[PDB]
Write a protein that binds this ligand. Structure first.
Ligand SMILES: Cc1ncc(COP(=O)(O)O)c(/C=N/[C@H]2[C@H](O)[C@@H](O)[C@@H](OP(=O)(O)OP(=O)(O)OC[C@H]3O[C@@H](n4cc(C)c(=O)[nH]c4=O)C[C@@H]3O)O[C@@H]2C)c1O
Ligand SMILES: Cc1ncc(COP(=O)(O)O)c(/C=N/[C@H]2[C@H](O)[C@@H](O)[C@@H](OP(=O)(O)OP(=O)(O)OC[C@H]3O[C@@H](n4cc(C)c(=O)[nH]c4=O)C[C@@H]3O)O[C@@H]2C)c1O
Ligand SMILES: [Cl-]
Ligand SMILES: [Cl-]
Ligand SMILES: [Cl-]
Ligand SMILES: [Cl-]
Ligand code: NA
Ligand code: NA
Lengths: 351, 351
């Protein structure tokens, strides 16, 4: 039964839909450098994920490039290489590229960057990871960055449709990023998106194109803070088509999977910390066992995220050692979920 | 007849062929993190472009990420952020990402980084741009870097199939990069490739995946010098298909178009400096006028590359003021070439 578990739902192109979209590229020979699909996908993300008009929606090559293009654009606007703090319990993206020298501090027990740990640090902003669709106490972080006059970026790579006080979590802070990597619920191949205050929109958009702005003609000027961060229209067509066919079913079905775990917790596990009133839409079901344990004890497909970036982050290491990330996708039957919960109950009695 | 000039030939997916290649992805749900297409495109590039076995062929998301992945891999291998010199007369890529603090020096009149400008300064390596399919005197750079114990990278973004003393220019220096951007002769959408000494292959390839090596399980370690730099298998399929169908015709027709300009040079125009014995395979036909002039004087689709990264570099600036980059692609007719040449004679008579 559980032998057939996969991390990601089986994802195949709607070839007729993808070919219809790319027929726009074929007619003009424009397949990149902001061809005719980019605005269709940015529009679809705004209207489907419910991004406020105060935010630009900016697609990039991947979730990593979304975060990097966001920072390089803000670096260009403020005129220096900004110093960000990130949490140890997250993916490498937030200590790479323009963040390669980001400061790493521990999480608190709610899964986000420990605000008590930056007391005595020099920094311009913080990056907080909303883990696998779960969200932190977002207003704790908004209030803190308002009071201390800091930039706030939410790493929502795995968190495209978790609502906080009646609005997509992507709408909070100065910006968020989401991943359309194949392993993400909304993903297909590679891609990313920046949700950012309009203040920074132009510098981030031209920052996808080496900092060059064709609208300036001979005044067009590259920035050493920019790169090739743009989304290819080919990738936009595959992502847009996947979202068109699947995004509603993913939200409802992922919410249904979360409901079953919430009402049938195996003994001595807890749900990863989450601060949304409705079920989050998760990239995996993350449970914390009450004691450290090794994945090879679990006789079904399962993972640990995230290996701490700084292995001297004690709260981050504890979570890593105690966490069990279970597949969450639209291919999973309830029968499989109940068979999973029974294997975990067994494990809990013998460990 | 010059109304219908395009920079790039009309490029259209061979959909039955692309569908056939991506069927391997559909069968396993693996569309990135090195799916079943990556090895196929890497092999084709090795066998078709005639790369030697002492070189890795490593595809990436774009030409920029090929350069940045190359530098990040080497930085991580040597345990230090290496200092590169780049030429002013190049694209912004070689002053971005891990090269954002690269030293910019002038070209000499042969079109490459002026070695006299790095006699008395600190640096680990040089990046030399082979402009639009033209190649520098490659052995003077190989000899200099061997004598001074310096790394040598060729920015071959626009230069996939120009031969130097019997082998693809990509096989010289410690590494080269090529672009599969839609604007490149070999390109389709977005893509890049690294041709590099085997010594650096493993650090560069894991460096496309945040520095992570799955084969090491728990000792898998991210690097602050890495990123998401991989090519998605979707992109690999479009590029591999375009190359299967067109690469031979592009090589022959681009060489024939060059032959016509070389035997019918317009008045007071010289070919861009080139050191290949056979006609180079050009991304555009670059001519130097005998004095500065404006593009708005040329009554057909034409460009100037490259706006100097450092506007104070005198040879780079002189080149930019005198250069005319004429479309070179497999849609161009001989009729159109002789018309362009007639227009440039008329331009010379009046300027
Ligand atoms: C908080 C955060 N911020 C930023 C980012 C950066 O976003 P991107 O630049 O990646 O868009 C991430 C990435 N988060 C993602 C990564 O994107 C992904 O590589 C995977 O990191 P790995 O676990 O190292 O990948 P891999 O082991 O290859 O795949 C996991 C499972 O998915 C399966 N899979 C994978 C791919 C690529 C596929 O095409 N099909 C498929 O079935 C295989 C396996 O069972 O998951 C992370 C959580 C992130 O979690
Ligand atoms: C020396 C060197 N190193 C590194 C790189 C970096 O490689 P990538 O990361 O780009 O793969 C480049 C790129 N060199 C290329 C760039 O790839 C391209 O953006 C274009 O830089 P722009 O001139 O700023 O782009 P754009 O004006 O949009 O395109 C030029 C012409 O191509 C036409 N076009 C363009 C696209 C994107 C398309 O899809 N279809 C099409 O017909 C329109 C126009 O007439 O040309 C450069 C020489 C380079 O020349
Ligand atoms: Cl809420
Ligand atoms: Cl679909
Ligand atoms: Cl084709
Ligand atoms: Cl030769
Ligand atoms: Na927008
Ligand atoms: Na706001």
């Amino acid at each position: 039964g559980l032998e057939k578990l996969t991390w990601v739902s089986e994802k195949k192109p709607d070839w007729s839909n993808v070919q219809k979209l790319i027929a726009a590229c074929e007619a003009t020979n424009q397949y990149t450098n902001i061809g005719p699909i980019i605005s269709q996908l940015e529009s679809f993300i705004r209207d489907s994920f419910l991004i406020e008009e105060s935010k630009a929606v900016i697609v990039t090559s991947n979730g990593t490039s979304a975060l990097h293009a966001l920072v390089g654009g803000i670096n260009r606007q403020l005129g220096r290489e900004l110093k960000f703090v990130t949490q140890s319990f997250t993916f490498p993206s937030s200590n790479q590229g323009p963040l390669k020298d980001s400061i790493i501090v521990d999480i608190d027990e709610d899964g986000g960057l420990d605000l008590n740990a930056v007391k005595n640090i020099e920094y311009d902003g913080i990056i907080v990871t909303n883990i696998h669709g779960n969200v932190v106490d977002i207003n704790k972080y908004v209030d803190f960055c308002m009071n201390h006059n800091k930039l706030l970026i939410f790493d929502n790579a795995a968190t495209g449709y978790t609502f906080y006080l009646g609005k997509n979590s992507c709408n909070y802070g100065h910006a968020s990023i989401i991943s359309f990597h194949h392993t993400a619920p909304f993903g297909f191949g590679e891609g990313g998106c920046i949700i950012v205050d309009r203040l920074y929109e132009n510098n981030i958009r031209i920052g996808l194109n080496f900092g060059l702005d064709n609208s300036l003609g001979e005044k067009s000027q590259y920035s050493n803070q920019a790169s090739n961060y743009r989304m290819c229209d080919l990738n936009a067509a595959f992502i847009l088509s996947y979202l068109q066919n699947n995004y509603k079913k993913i939200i409802n079905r992922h919410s249904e999977i979360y409901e079953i775990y919430k009402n049938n917790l195996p003994k001595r596990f807890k749900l990863f910390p989450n601060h949304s009133k409705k079920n989050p839409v998760c990239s995996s079901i993350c449970l914390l066992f009450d004691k450290p344990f090794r994945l090879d004890k679990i006789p079904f497909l399962s993972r640990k995220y995230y290996k701490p970036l700084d292995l001297s982050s004690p709260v981050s290491l504890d979570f890593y050692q105690r966490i069990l990330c279970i597949p969450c996708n639209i291919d999973l039957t309830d029968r499989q979920i109940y068979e999973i919960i029974g294997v975990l109950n067994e494990f809990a009695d013998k460990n």
